[PDB]
Amino acid sequence: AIERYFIREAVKEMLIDEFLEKELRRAGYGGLDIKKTPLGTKVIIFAANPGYVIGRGGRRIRELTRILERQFGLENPQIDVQEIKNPYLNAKVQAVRIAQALERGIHFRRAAYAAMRAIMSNGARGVEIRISGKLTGERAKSVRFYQGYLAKVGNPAETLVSKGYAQALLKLGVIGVKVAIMPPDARLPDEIEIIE
Amino acid sequence: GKIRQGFIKRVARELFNKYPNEFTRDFEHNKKKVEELTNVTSKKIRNRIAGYITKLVRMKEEGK
Amino acid sequence: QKARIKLASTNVRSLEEVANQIKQIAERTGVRMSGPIPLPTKRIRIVTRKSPDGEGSATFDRWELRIHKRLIDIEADERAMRQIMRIRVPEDVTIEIELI
Amino acid sequence: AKADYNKRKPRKFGKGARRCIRCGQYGPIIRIHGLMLCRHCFREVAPKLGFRKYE
RNA sequence: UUAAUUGGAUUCAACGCCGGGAACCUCACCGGGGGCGACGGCAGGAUGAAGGCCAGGCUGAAGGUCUUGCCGGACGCGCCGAGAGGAGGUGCAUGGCCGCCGUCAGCUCGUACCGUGAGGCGUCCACUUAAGUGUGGUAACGAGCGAGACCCGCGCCCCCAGUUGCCAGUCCCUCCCGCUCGGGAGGGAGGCACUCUGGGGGGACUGCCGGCGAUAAGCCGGAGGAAGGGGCGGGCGACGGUAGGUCAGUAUGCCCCGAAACCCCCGGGCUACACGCGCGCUACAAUGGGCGGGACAAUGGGUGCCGACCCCGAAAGGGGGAGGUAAUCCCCUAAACCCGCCCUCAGUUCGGAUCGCGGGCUGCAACUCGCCCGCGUGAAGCUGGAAUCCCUAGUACCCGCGCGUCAUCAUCGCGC
RNA sequence: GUCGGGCUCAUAACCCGAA
Ligand SMILES: [Mg+2]
Ligand SMILES: [Mg+2]
Ligand SMILES: [Mg+2]
Ligand SMILES: [Mg+2]
Ligand SMILES: [Mg+2]
Ligand SMILES: [Mg+2]
Ligand SMILES: [Mg+2]
Ligand SMILES: [Mg+2]
Ligand SMILES: [Mg+2]
Ligand SMILES: [Mg+2]
Ligand SMILES: [Mg+2]
Ligand SMILES: [Mg+2]
Ligand SMILES: [Mg+2]
Ligand SMILES: [Mg+2]
Ligand SMILES: [Mg+2]
Ligand SMILES: [Mg+2]
Ligand SMILES: [Mg+2]
Ligand SMILES: [Mg+2]
Ligand SMILES: [Mg+2]
Ligand SMILES: [Mg+2]
Ligand SMILES: [Mg+2]
Ligand SMILES: [Mg+2]
Ligand SMILES: [Mg+2]
Ligand SMILES: [Mg+2]
Ligand SMILES: [Zn+2]
């Protein structure tokens, strides 16, 4: 029946998104979108360095089209590569960037403060970052960085805040990175104004 | 406990001062006035604000 | 000589938009169109245990997916059928047209 | 033929005929409406599929 | 106890928990049998490496090995590195998730001020609140996260909409009754009234009245009202701690195995049984048991499927098969309850454990170790010591039903 | 005195049943 049709579409998109998440980690992957046309399927991919996805004049778009058509269930795909709309308001991108900075060898506090500075300058109401794992020794710990306005409990926190998570694999083990960001156009229920 | 909320009181005090000759001791009239003079979107919040404005009008008119 | 149009979506606004556009097309021409009939909403509820292990008090999540539906009847006239056949619904909407 | 002794028998029923499409686990598989996902995996991807916790 | 009876969890917060209802699989345990080393290089190899077979032995069964002799053409585990894979160790090396403290009212910040300093102040006092919820006073004045606001559903009213849902009034046709003045039942035309479905809107604000408190914050009692004082039921759990649980869901460091601790196949085991314990089911009967007759649901689910309707059979079941990708067809004419008759306080016409014989279904397989039906058989139990659990209204008690798991199997979980 | 169960985070004391 009809319910089975909607579930099949959702699962395939989730599998494709996860495969692209891991595959395009160096390109600053920032989501995808799929549109259905009478000739086939238009697949739009978002990234920071589209040259990496293109991969030195093709030889990689062909591979990805073959993967999409064979392994996954798209018929006659066509991949376009675009640019991220508001990268500093996307928690997932920032979590991946902080994780890569940690993998390079920067100290965790400096990386966290740099990311917060960029996010706040780019027009966000608030940001919260948490970093957990074996930071400075064999006994694990968690550290939290914060500034601005950020709702945490209730329906507004669910529908307004952008959330992201990433793992950073260092020589001693993994380090978890969590990011939350609230946009400039977010308005809480208790913020009323008088119509002048 | 029916303790009035802070932001309701703040906005009702702001509305009352700006238009002293706009709110009466009628709940329906004040409800329509709150509807026209703000961007409040919740029906519950509008009613709370209108009720507090009614109490303010009768408290100041009585002279406290 | 009548066509039956079936619509379904997870979003109420888009569904409403498509139905209103078809209604405007049926208004723009001399043709009777039975109003969009709302069929009962399909609900998919799944209940799961929250913990990965089996220690501690048992607690549960109740996840829900809602699929809304509409039904529209119109008389198959080509001057009116061309306008409706060229409409593009958003990708999150299923549309099916049949002739009865 | 030696590779014959590595190969699995293709069952059609039992716990061995169903694996999670995300992590490969046997066992607690949610079969509702054609999903094939473990209880563990369904919890963390349910929002991406469009499910919500209304109550 | 055993060849093995695989492992985790032990006060609340372990013990129908790990969605753990395991015949194979699952599987990690036990007995036995086979297979696997990308890439670098050593002996080697067309005078053919590695790999593959008709027949018959060994064998539980096997070109696995062997015998009998055929095949094919290029890499090379007889060797050293190296690697794949690992439900192997470590939750006291970690990430993520979850339980508890606790939906408790807490945790903090900027500047000022106090103390040599650790620190203090705000965050204290009175009254008030479900609430660090508020109103006044104050070396504090202000602010953030949590509370509340917010989101989903239930109960009343209006507008729009009329199919696959509804049938009151109206017209025709057919058949019944007390023979038709009157009363019923189908079918068709027709309609959207009513029920219902689902988009939008209204409605409740301590707003009105009288008291207490201060004339503040609020509290107590009345009207009107579908609804009255978070209206009712849910989702959402702050800074942290608990070396709480989980590497046996997935991710991951180190250590190990690496011709076996990796990968497959067959048969066993997780279902053992002097005994201690948790949570339940069925009873100990009349506030009942049996036999015939009569009533009224809701949630959900269906193409690897739900199956009306006809035929066959005493039953379980068997042979055909309309419609259904579903407001259309099906699961689907619930039980507790009501009427009449037998039994009359008894280990019984209470109870139905245990066992014999026979008939079925699913499955590759029913002994170990599955579920159903007919006849027979007829254990303990006659109300429960010391202790101890749940629940404040459509709640508790009592009664059945749907879905998950699922080829078959529900004394369970989640819902009606 | 023996054995078993209660109570306690647990042991002793204490309570109950039995041979
Ligand atoms: Mg709240
Ligand atoms: Mg055990
Ligand atoms: Mg079983
Ligand atoms: Mg087994
Ligand atoms: Mg721990
Ligand atoms: Mg505390
Ligand atoms: Mg000083
Ligand atoms: Mg203090
Ligand atoms: Mg405090
Ligand atoms: Mg003090
Ligand atoms: Mg507060
Ligand atoms: Mg409430
Ligand atoms: Mg521990
Ligand atoms: Mg413990
Ligand atoms: Mg067991
Ligand atoms: Mg009997
Ligand atoms: Mg009867
Ligand atoms: Mg007897
Ligand atoms: Mg027999
Ligand atoms: Mg048997
Ligand atoms: Mg006796
Ligand atoms: Mg008796
Ligand atoms: Mg169970
Ligand atoms: Mg003792
Ligand atoms: Zn899984």
Swiss-Prot record, chain A:
Signal peptide: none
Any single biological process term in GO: translation
Stretches assigned to the KH type-2 domain: 16-85
InterPro entries: KH_dom (IPR004087), KH_dom-like_a/b (IPR015946), KH_dom_type_2 (IPR004044), KH_sf_prok-type (IPR009019), Ribosomal_S3_C_sf (IPR036419), Ribosomal_uS3_arc (IPR027488), Ribosomal_uS3_C (IPR001351), Ribosomal_uS3_euk/arc (IPR005703)
CC annotations in GO: cytosolic small ribosomal subunit
Pfam families: KH_2, Ribosomal_S3_C
KW Ribonucleoprotein (keyword) present: yes
Subunit structure: Part of the 30S ribosomal subunit.
Family: Belongs to the universal ribosomal protein uS3 family.
UniProt protein name: Small ribosomal subunit protein uS3
Species name: Pyrococcus abyssi (strain GE5 / Orsay)
Lineage of origin: Archaea, Methanobacteriati, Methanobacteriota, Thermococci, Thermococcales
Swiss-Prot record, chain B:
One CC-aspect GO term: ribonucleoprotein complex
UniProt-listed Gene3D superfamilies: Ribosomal protein S17e-like
InterPro entries listed in its UniProt record: Ribosomal_eS17, Ribosomal_eS17_CS, Ribosomal_eS17_sf
Statement: the UniProt record of this protein carries the keyword Cell division: no
Keywords (A to Z) from UniProt: Ribonucleoprotein, Ribosomal protein
Classification via Pfam families: Ribosomal_S17e
GO biological process, one term: translation
Source organism, top-level taxon: Archaea
GO molecular function, one term: structural constituent of ribosome
Family statement: Belongs to the eukaryotic ribosomal protein eS17 family.
PANTHER family, per database record: 40S RIBOSOMAL PROTEIN S17
Protein name (record): Small ribosomal subunit protein eS17
Organism of this sequence: Pyrococcus abyssi (strain GE5 / Orsay)
Gene that specifies this protein: rps17e
From Swiss-Prot, chain C:
SMART domains in alphabetical order: Ribosomal_S10
Family matches, as InterPro entries: Ribosomal_uS10 (IPR001848), Ribosomal_uS10_CS (IPR018268), Ribosomal_uS10_dom (IPR027486), Ribosomal_uS10_dom_sf (IPR036838), Ribosomal_uS10_euk/arc (IPR005729)
GO biological process, one term: translation
Gene3D superfamilies referenced in this protein's UniProt entry, alphabetically: Ribosomal protein S10 domain
GO cellular component labels: small ribosomal subunit
Keywords: Ribonucleoprotein, Ribosomal protein
Molecular function as annotated in GO: structural constituent of ribosome; tRNA binding
Functional description taken from the UniProt entry: Involved in the binding of tRNA to the ribosomes.
Family: Belongs to the universal ribosomal protein uS10 family.
Subunit composition and interactions: Part of the 30S ribosomal subunit.
Name of this protein: Small ribosomal subunit protein uS10
Gene that this polypeptide is encoded by: rps10
Swiss-Prot record, chain D:
A Pfam family hit: Ribosomal_S14
Keywords on record: Metal-binding, Ribonucleoprotein, Ribosomal protein, RNA-binding, rRNA-binding, Zinc
Cofactor(s), by name: Zn(2+)
KW Manganese (keyword) present: no
Leader sequence residues: none
Residues that coordinate or bind Zn(2+): 20, 23, 38, 41
Function according to Swiss-Prot or TrEMBL: Binds 16S rRNA, required for the assembly of 30S particles.
NCBIfam families with a match to the protein in the record: PRK05766.1 (NF004424)
Protein name: Small ribosomal subunit protein uS14
The organism of origin for this protein: Pyrococcus abyssi (strain GE5 / Orsay)
